[PDB]
Amino acid sequence: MSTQSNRNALVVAQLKGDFVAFLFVLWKALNLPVPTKCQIDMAKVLANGDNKKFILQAFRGIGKSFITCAFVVWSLWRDPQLKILIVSASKERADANSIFIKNIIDLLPFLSELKPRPGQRDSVISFDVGPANPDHSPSVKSVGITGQLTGSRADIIIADDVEIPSNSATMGAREKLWTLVQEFAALLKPLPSSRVIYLGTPQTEMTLYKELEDNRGYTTIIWPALYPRTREENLYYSQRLAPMLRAEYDENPEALAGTPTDPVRFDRDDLRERELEYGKAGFTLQFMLNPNLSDAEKYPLRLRDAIVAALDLEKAPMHYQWLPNRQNIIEDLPNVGLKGDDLHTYHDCSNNSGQYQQKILVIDPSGRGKDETGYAVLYTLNGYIYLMEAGGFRDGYSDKTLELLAKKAKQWGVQTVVYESNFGDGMFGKVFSPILLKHHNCAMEEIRARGMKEMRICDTLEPVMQTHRLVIRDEV
């Protein structure tokens, strides 16, 4: 039984965390820690099974240390007779983190508890020093670069409040070899958990903004905000109000500038928007009167010009069908025509309508977002399905367009979007286009349209951005 349970905890961190990690209360004695949805999400994200490198952009006044401690415990307690853990921090701050990890360890049952060799010996700063084997060492990040290089067979690095470590560039550079091509690859094959976990609240457009952006440009992990603490979701009268009054009360007895600083994890010197306002201000449009359908013609088709079309179909009322047509001929890609409509009550008459614009633009190849309606419209305008249109782009034969499976396509599609629009490789003419960009901002860990706005136009340009990366696109 013991072997099965130990192994169970070993590869199911959530179960280990919910069952064995305790706090010792004064009224109820040793009780189970009541994990929160954000903490549970964070535990899953930090595991050998998933990635290796994780970065959290969290707000302040979230009991993050409670989870970070449970993870670090779980790591050392279930390591394959191996592994050194070190943290980078300017304090005593890293000592506080390991204290909590020790608070977790000390409450474990015998069978899950490895024997303790060292434990804050000599009033440090360290547990399980020397072969035993796993260890956790609290370190100042200000010293290390020294701490990173000096470590012998490092397995995990946790970096507390990474955004508030001054002169981090050298310490960060020291980290690169430890993770990036890389003893990390070699240790991961051995099943060496560890790994690099960074968690902290943002601090302007420093080094961390670069880390978060590079991560978010590729993935959408991870960020929780004041609302993650569900206790805030109930007012004084003990009625659910979706943190309406707690937020009001917290805004008062303080400041709005302090509330974004403390409970929002927003970066200072910038809005959320994917496209910088510095660029959104320069963007001019071309006003045009659309057809009976939702077609806006910016520049008419020309013979011997190559066009590309992207289509983000509308799953329901809610939003619109968005078809951009982009002149691909020259070095600078211009948007020459857009179809924007929510009048398509029929799942059914769009393929023909779209086709005449695709045909109008020199048999324009089209890359359709494979959503429920997408897959759909795919078939009707397929070379084989109904309209026999031979210029429908597909990443596979099962998938007659852009498969939206796996997060990455949208991520890099947004990342390439940003580049294309900002470096002025792609020129947008549609008014409603740029207005959607105005509100297509951070929805950590991705981007979306804020309350009461549509992102249909922007999202179908994201498909173009993703398509932009593709080798086949390098001359459709």
Side-chain angles (χ1 to χ4, degrees):
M1 298 181 64
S2 290
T3 61
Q4 295 181 329
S5 183
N6 185 299
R7 293 180 177 275
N8 185 303
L10 183 158
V11 63
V12 71
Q14 183 64 57
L15 181 71
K16 182 64 177 67
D18 294 345
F19 292 31
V20 194
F22 294 36
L23 184 61
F24 179 84
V25 72
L26 188 159
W27 295 356
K28 300 290 295 182
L30 190 58
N31 294 312
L32 298 177
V34 60
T36 179
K37 298 293 296 180
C38 63
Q39 290 181 328
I40 67 177
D41 291 329
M42 223 176 301
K44 287 187 175 183
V45 66
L46 281 65
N48 61 30
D50 63 321
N51 180 354
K52 82 187 160 148
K53 293 183 295 293
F54 296 98
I55 308 308
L56 299 166
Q57 58 163 79
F59 64 95
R60 199 145 275 164
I62 182 62
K64 62 147 193 302
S65 181
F66 293 30
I67 59 187
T68 60
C69 65
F71 175 66
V72 61
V73 67
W74 181 91
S75 183
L76 186 153
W77 293 93
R78 295 295 179 275
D79 293 305
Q81 68 185 48
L82 177 67
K83 292 181 177 66
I84 180 177
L85 182 150
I86 308 299
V87 59
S88 297
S90 188
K91 296 182 181 179
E92 60 184 59
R93 186 177 292 277
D95 294 342
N97 290 278
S98 183
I99 299 307
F100 292 30
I101 80 177
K102 292 167 64 184
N103 289 279
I104 303 301
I105 291 196
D106 184 56
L107 262 38
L108 294 181
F110 297 150
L111 186 156
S112 295
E113 72 179 65
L114 298 181
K115 63 181 181 63
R117 307 185 176 253
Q120 180 183 2
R121 294 181 177 274
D122 178 76
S123 59
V124 298
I125 299 172
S126 184
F127 184 76
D128 293 310
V129 188
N133 196 278
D135 58 315
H136 295 295
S137 313
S139 300
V140 65
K141 187 173 181 299
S142 301
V143 66
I145 68 176
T146 65
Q148 290 181 64
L149 295 176
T150 61
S152 179
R153 68 185 177 79
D155 296 335
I156 195 166
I157 300 176
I158 60 172
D160 189 340
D161 80 324
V162 55
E163 193 45 345
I164 305 181
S166 298
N167 196 77
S168 178
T170 60
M171 183 62 171
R174 295 296 183 271
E175 183 284 332
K176 293 294 295 182
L177 291 178
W178 296 95
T179 61
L180 185 160
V181 73
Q182 50 215 47
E183 296 76 7
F184 181 82
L187 295 177
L188 293 181
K189 297 182 176 181
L191 297 176
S193 54
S194 314
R195 305 145 67 79
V196 177
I197 297 73
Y198 305 148
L199 184 164
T201 66
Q203 178 197 300
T204 302
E205 293 292 0
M206 293 184 306
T207 185
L208 181 161
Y209 178 86
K210 296 293 295 181
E211 72 186 47
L212 181 60
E213 64 181 58
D214 188 330
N215 293 119
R216 184 180 296 174
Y218 183 83
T219 60
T220 55
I221 72 174
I222 304 180
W223 178 99
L226 184 66
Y227 62 91
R229 295 180 64 185
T230 187
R231 294 180 64 86
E232 298 183 293
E233 309 198 324
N234 296 123
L235 275 51
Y236 295 151
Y237 178 87
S238 297
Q239 68 291 1
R240 297 283 168 189
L241 175 76
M244 300 171 60
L245 183 61
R246 182 63 179 181
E248 296 181 55
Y249 182 81
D250 186 54
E251 180 286 326
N252 296 337
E254 73 181 56
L256 272 95
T259 305
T261 297
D262 180 341
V264 178
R265 176 85 192 55
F266 180 82
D267 295 335
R268 296 293 180 276
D269 182 71
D270 180 17
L271 190 62
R272 293 194 297 272
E273 61 179 348
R274 60 173 176 96
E275 294 297 321
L276 185 61
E277 179 286 330
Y278 181 82
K280 294 184 57 74
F283 297 151
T284 185
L285 298 157
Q286 181 180 0
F287 182 83
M288 183 62 72
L289 183 160
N290 66 25
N292 298 116
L293 295 176
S294 68
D295 193 331
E297 292 291 358
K298 297 296 180 295
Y299 296 96
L301 185 64
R302 299 291 180 275
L303 294 176
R304 298 178 61 85
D305 293 339
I307 305 297
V308 299
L311 179 62
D312 183 21
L313 297 176
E314 61 177 299
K315 297 179 66 69
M318 294 279 94
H319 303 70
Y320 286 67
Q321 179 184 66
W322 184 255
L323 178 79
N325 293 120
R326 301 291 297 177
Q327 184 62 264
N328 72 59
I329 56 172
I330 62 173
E331 183 286 329
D332 187 329
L333 302 178
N335 190 357
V336 297
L338 283 68
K339 296 288 300 178
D341 56 24
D342 63 24
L343 293 178
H344 294 174
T345 179
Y346 294 33
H347 181 271
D348 309 296
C349 63
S350 179
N351 290 115
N352 291 116
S353 62
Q355 183 181 57
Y356 292 97
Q357 294 298 322
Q358 294 297 98
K359 185 63 180 64
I360 287 168
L361 297 174
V362 63
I363 65 174
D364 180 68
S366 183
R368 309 186 282 282
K370 290 180 71 66
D371 61 33
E372 67 184 51
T373 303
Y375 293 94
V377 168
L378 314 172
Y379 66 78
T380 298
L381 185 168
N382 183 335
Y384 183 81
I385 305 297
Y386 300 149
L387 294 176
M388 298 182 64
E389 182 286 338
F393 185 81
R394 61 177 180 278
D395 8 288
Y397 284 126
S398 182
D399 296 332
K400 295 294 295 181
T401 44
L402 185 158
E403 183 179 59
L404 181 166
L405 185 163
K407 300 280 183 172
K408 186 177 179 297
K410 186 192 180 190
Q411 293 302 102
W412 186 90
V414 177
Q415 182 180 60
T416 307
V417 68
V418 69
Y419 294 152
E420 297 184 46
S421 55
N422 290 279
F423 292 32
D425 188 328
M427 183 181 68
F428 293 29
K430 182 59 180 62
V431 307
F432 294 26
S433 195
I435 68 176
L436 277 61
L437 281 56
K438 297 182 177 61
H439 70 80
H440 187 56
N441 68 51
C442 302
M444 188 67 171
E445 315 68 4
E446 305 191 326
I447 305 301
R448 294 299 289 177
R450 62 176 179 279
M452 183 63 74
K453 290 181 172 83
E454 291 295 352
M455 64 173 84
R456 293 296 180 175
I457 85 190
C458 66
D459 292 343
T460 314
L461 284 172
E462 183 287 328
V464 176
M465 302 293 130
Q466 183 60 265
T467 62
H468 182 201
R469 205 159 39 188
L470 296 177
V471 60
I472 303 300
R473 183 173 177 283
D474 64 28
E475 278 182 323
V476 65

Coordinates of all heavy atoms in Angstrom, one line a residue, residues 87-100 125 138-141 160:
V87 N 17.3 29.2 -4.6 CA 16.5 30.3 -5.0 C 17.4 31.6 -5.0 O 18.3 31.8 -4.2 CB 15.4 30.5 -3.9 CG1 15.9 30.7 -2.5 CG2 14.4 31.6 -4.2
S88 N 16.9 32.5 -5.9 CA 17.6 33.8 -6.0 C 16.7 34.9 -5.4 O 15.5 35.0 -5.9 CB 17.9 34.1 -7.5 OG 18.7 33.1 -8.0
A89 N 17.2 35.6 -4.5 CA 16.4 36.7 -3.8 C 17.3 37.6 -3.0 O 18.3 37.2 -2.5 CB 15.4 36.1 -2.8
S90 N 17.0 38.9 -2.8 CA 17.8 39.9 -2.2 C 17.8 39.8 -0.6 O 18.6 40.4 0.1 CB 17.4 41.2 -2.6 OG 18.3 42.2 -2.1
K91 N 16.9 38.9 -0.1 CA 16.8 38.8 1.3 C 17.0 37.3 1.8 O 16.7 36.4 1.0 CB 15.4 39.4 1.6 CG 15.1 40.9 1.3 CD 13.7 41.2 1.7 CE 13.4 42.6 1.4 NZ 12.1 43.0 1.8
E92 N 17.2 37.2 3.1 CA 16.2 36.8 4.1 C 14.8 36.5 3.6 O 14.0 35.8 4.2 CB 16.1 37.9 5.2 CG 15.7 39.2 4.6 CD 15.6 40.5 5.4 OE1 16.7 40.8 6.0 OE2 14.5 41.0 5.5
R93 N 14.5 37.0 2.4 CA 13.3 36.8 1.6 C 13.3 35.3 1.2 O 12.3 34.7 1.4 CB 13.2 37.6 0.4 CG 11.9 37.6 -0.4 CD 11.9 38.5 -1.6 NE 11.9 39.9 -1.1 CZ 10.8 40.6 -0.8 NH1 9.6 40.0 -0.8 NH2 11.0 41.9 -0.4
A94 N 14.4 34.9 0.6 CA 14.5 33.5 0.2 C 14.6 32.5 1.4 O 14.1 31.4 1.3 CB 15.9 33.3 -0.5
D95 N 15.0 33.0 2.6 CA 15.0 32.3 3.8 C 13.6 32.1 4.3 O 13.3 31.0 4.7 CB 15.8 33.0 4.9 CG 17.3 33.1 4.6 OD1 17.8 32.3 3.8 OD2 18.0 33.9 5.2
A96 N 12.7 33.1 4.1 CA 11.3 33.0 4.5 C 10.6 32.0 3.6 O 9.7 31.2 4.1 CB 10.7 34.4 4.3
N97 N 11.0 31.9 2.3 CA 10.4 30.9 1.4 C 10.6 29.4 1.8 O 9.7 28.7 2.0 CB 10.9 31.1 0.0 CG 10.4 32.4 -0.6 OD1 9.3 32.5 -1.1 ND2 11.2 33.4 -0.6
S98 N 11.9 29.2 2.1 CA 12.3 27.8 2.6 C 11.8 27.5 4.0 O 11.5 26.4 4.4 CB 13.8 27.7 2.6 OG 14.2 26.3 2.9
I99 N 11.5 28.5 4.8 CA 10.9 28.3 6.1 C 9.6 27.7 5.9 O 9.4 26.6 6.5 CB 10.8 29.7 6.9 CG1 12.2 30.3 7.1 CG2 10.2 29.5 8.2 CD1 13.2 29.5 7.7
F100 N 8.8 28.2 4.9 CA 7.5 27.7 4.7 C 7.5 26.3 4.1 O 6.7 25.5 4.4 CB 6.8 28.7 3.7 CG 6.5 30.0 4.3 CD1 7.3 30.6 5.3 CD2 5.4 30.8 3.9 CE1 7.1 31.8 5.8 CE2 5.1 32.0 4.5 CZ 6.0 32.5 5.4
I125 N 19.1 28.9 6.4 CA 19.6 29.3 5.1 C 19.8 28.0 4.2 O 20.3 28.0 3.1 CB 20.9 30.1 5.0 CG1 20.8 31.5 5.7 CG2 21.6 30.3 3.7 CD1 22.1 32.2 5.8
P138 N 18.5 28.7 0.4 CA 18.2 30.1 0.4 C 19.4 31.0 0.1 O 20.4 31.0 0.8 CB 17.7 30.4 1.8 CG 17.2 29.1 2.4 CD 18.0 28.1 1.7
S139 N 19.3 31.8 -1.0 CA 20.4 32.6 -1.4 C 19.9 34.0 -1.9 O 18.8 34.1 -2.4 CB 21.2 32.0 -2.6 OG 21.7 30.8 -2.2
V140 N 20.7 35.0 -1.5 CA 20.6 36.3 -2.1 C 20.9 36.3 -3.6 O 21.9 35.8 -4.0 CB 21.3 37.4 -1.3 CG1 22.7 37.2 -1.3 CG2 21.0 38.8 -1.9
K141 N 20.1 36.9 -4.5 CA 20.3 36.9 -5.9 C 21.3 38.0 -6.2 O 21.9 38.1 -7.3 CB 19.0 37.2 -6.7 CG 19.2 37.0 -8.2 CD 17.9 37.1 -8.9 CE 18.1 36.9 -10.4 NZ 18.9 38.1 -10.9
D160 N 12.4 34.2 -6.5 CA 11.4 35.0 -5.8 C 11.5 36.5 -6.2 O 12.6 37.0 -6.4 CB 11.7 34.9 -4.3 CG 10.5 35.5 -3.4 OD1 9.8 36.4 -4.0 OD2 10.4 35.2 -2.3

